[PDB]
């Protein structure tokens, strides 16, 4: 068939350019015209072969436009390379945007175009027309419709972000993603936001003549001074591109928070918690203040958003750098601890507690509650310097929580207090012993502050309801806590 | 067979929380209270009853209508006439009061009643304040 004839020409050009590419600069245009045949069979074969050859022939550097014997032939070959690559990317872009549904004879031409574009992104990012290549991928990621091509484009950008060591390819993609997110009014699939989380920038005696020996000695000294200067310039350029990406990444994060996109705030807060330590100190205190405003706005669904911010606030301080700067930067989580305390009673009555490697973006509100409680009562730092009053206030409120929550939520809280009793012990033992009860006031359940309530003046009585709870796991869970208490 | 029974009971309970199935939801509570009262097992309905009370219709003002109040012992759904009717919101209103009292009177003697009833009391004062 004519496909056999076309296949022969494809094999001819590709092998011919592989062996000696300079001699035949017109094969790039030859690969073009035979691609405008109107049979879909050859068009699929032409596109793949063009991807194969260009990966073989693209050099390790960009080539400038000329404008204005062996030198002249290299100029002609390089100019032919750019012209073909520019034309190839235009053809790939048109096919990718073309209609996908066709006859069920296999993957359409669009799927091959995405496959070809993804391979070029991970193989030749440094070369010219990177934006035209990246615009094909980003245009696919702006549709909110998951298919095989959507995953393939996402996986390609994930690889590019975490293998970019210079930063130029990452910056150009981040600018495209940020602009697209704003242009779509943040109606994206939140897998594009997770791409920001993958940024790596943000984490034999050969004889030698008399003259031959003198040239190498001169070359070595020239290379030594160039290496020293290259090391210095590399540090400054890496830091500058990091600042530019940090500007675009953080600006997108805040604009989502201001517009309050419900399906993106979990992803945004993970990014803020991940990358807050890379920015200026004076902005770190602002992040906590911005979190407080979001919680106060929800205080005016809503339960999850306030719990998301509280998880982020503690995760911000759990970092070693932020922990050592507690006193210096005035990072007080007293607001979040109090707010988490006054919300425990309301969270019990909420029926949607169960309607559902990440540290912030978690789908279950009960899980978010457990993460906050672990931060307050079992911090990574200073676990045995926690104020006893704070421990007692939450312990009493948590038994009240366990009374009126679904079986699994009650079991989770029961297990949590088992660890709290085990790690601290005598700080909360008097709550289960009536003789050790304090007699310097009356217990205040609905206090506005943790210390305002007098929790050592009460006794944990809830065991007499949870011992007859319908769930055997809860009953065994309660028995687990007393076994720890009896072993204190 | 107590654990599997109330699991599927609360499951068929919490399938779709809508006004159409409020009488259906009400009957499932009564089955649970009877099981808990005959035995001595704890079944938490405080969220279930209060979720009834915090739906849209008892917040929105009703409409003036006149017809026969429905008997809450033979219905699995709500006829379309009751969507904003004064009669319906009263009809559920007597119910939510009744099962709340029945649930709370069961555990009205155990050592830990004040804490068992504390979150419900705060919720009810809150709901009264908004109404």
């Amino acid at each position: 068939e004519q496909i056999r004839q076309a296949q022969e020409e494809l094999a001819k050009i590709a092998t011919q350019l592989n062996e000696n590419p300079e001699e035949y600069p017109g094969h790039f245009k030859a690969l073009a015209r035979i691609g405008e045949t109107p049979i879909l069979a050859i068009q699929k074969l032409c596109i793949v072969t063009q991807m194969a050859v260009y990966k073989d022939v693209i050099p390790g550097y960009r080539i400038r436009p000329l404008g204005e014997k062996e030198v002249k032939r290299l100029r002609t070959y390089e100019q032919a390379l750019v012209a073909g690559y520019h034309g190839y990317l235009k053809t790939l872009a048109t096919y990718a945007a073309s209609s996908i549904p066709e006859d069920r004879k296999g993957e359409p031409i669009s799927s091959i175009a995405f496959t070809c574009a993804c391979e070029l992104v991970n193989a030749v990012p440094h070369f010219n027309f990177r934006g035209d290549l990246l615009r094909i991928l980003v245009k696919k990621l702006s549709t909110r419709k998951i298919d095989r091509d959507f995953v393939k484009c996402r996986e390609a950008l994930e690889k590019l972000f975490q293998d970019d060591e210079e930063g130029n390819a990452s910056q150009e993609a981040v600018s495209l993603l940020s602009k697209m997110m704003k242009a779509r009014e943040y109606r994206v699939d939140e897998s594009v936001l997770n791409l920001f989380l993958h940024l790596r920038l943000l984490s034999k005696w050969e004889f030698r003549t008399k003259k031959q020996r003198k040239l190498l000695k001169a070359e070595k000294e020239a290379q030594k001074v160039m290496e020293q200067a290259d090391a210095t310039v590399s540090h400054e350029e890496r830091e500058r591109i990091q600042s530019e990406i940090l500007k675009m990444v953080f600006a997108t994060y805040f604009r989502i928070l201001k517009a309050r996109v419900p399906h993106l705030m979990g992803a945004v807060l993970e990014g803020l918690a991940k990358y807050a330590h890379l920015i200026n100190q004076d902005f770190f205190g602002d992040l906590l203040e911005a979190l407080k405003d979001l919680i106060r706005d929800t205080d005016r669904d809503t339960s999850r958003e306030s719990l998301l911010c509280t998880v982020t606030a503690f995760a911000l301080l759990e970092g070693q750098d932020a922990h050592n700067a507690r006193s210096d930067l005035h990072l007080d989580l007293s607001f979040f601890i109090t707010n988490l305390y006054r919300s425990l009673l309301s969270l019990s009555l909420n029926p949607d507690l169960e309607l559902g490697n990440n540290k912030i973006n978690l789908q279950t509100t009960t899980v978010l509650l457990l993460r906050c409680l672990t931060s307050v009562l079992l911090p990574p730092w200073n676990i045995r310097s926690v104020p006893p009053i704070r421990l007692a206030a939450f312990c009493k409120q948590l038994m009240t929580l366990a009374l009126q929550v679904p079986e699994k939520s009650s079991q989770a809280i029961l297990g949590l207090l088992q660890d709290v009793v085990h790690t601290h012990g005598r700080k909360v033992a008097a709550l289960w012993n009536t003789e050790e009860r304090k007699g310097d006031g009356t217990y205040k359940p609905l206090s506005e502050t943790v210390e305002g309530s007098n929790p050592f003046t009460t006794t944990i009585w809830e065991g007499e309801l949870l011992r007859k709870h319908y769930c055997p796991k809860v009953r065994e869970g309660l028995k687990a806590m007393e076994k720890e208490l009896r072993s204190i | 067979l107590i654990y599997p029974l109330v699991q599927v009971t609360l499951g068929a309970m919490r399938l779709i929380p809508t006004a159409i199935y409020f009488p259906l939801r009400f009957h499932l509570i009564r089955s649970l209270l009877r099981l808990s009262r005959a035995t001595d097992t704890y079944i938490p309905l405080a969220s279930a009853l209060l979720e009834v009370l915090q739906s849209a219709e008892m917040k929105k003002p009703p409409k003036s209508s006149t017809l026969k109040p429905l008997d809450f012992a033979t219905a699995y759904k709500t006829p379309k006439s009751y969507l904003r009717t004064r009669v319906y919101q009263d009809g559920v209103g007597e119910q939510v009061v009744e099962l709340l009292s029945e649930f709370f009177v069961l555990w009205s003697r155990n050592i830990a009643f004040p804490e068992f009833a504390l979150p419900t009391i705060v919720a009810l004062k809150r709901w009264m304040k908004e109404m």
Binding site: T364, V367, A412 | -
Partner: peptide, 20 residues
């Protein structure tokens, strides 16, 4: 220990303990 094990999101599917 126990708090971390119950804090993972794959604890709260909804599987009934009659259909093990």
């Amino acid at each position: 220990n126990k708090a971390a094990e119950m804090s993972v999101d794959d604890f709260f599917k909804g599987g009934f303990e009659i259909l093990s």
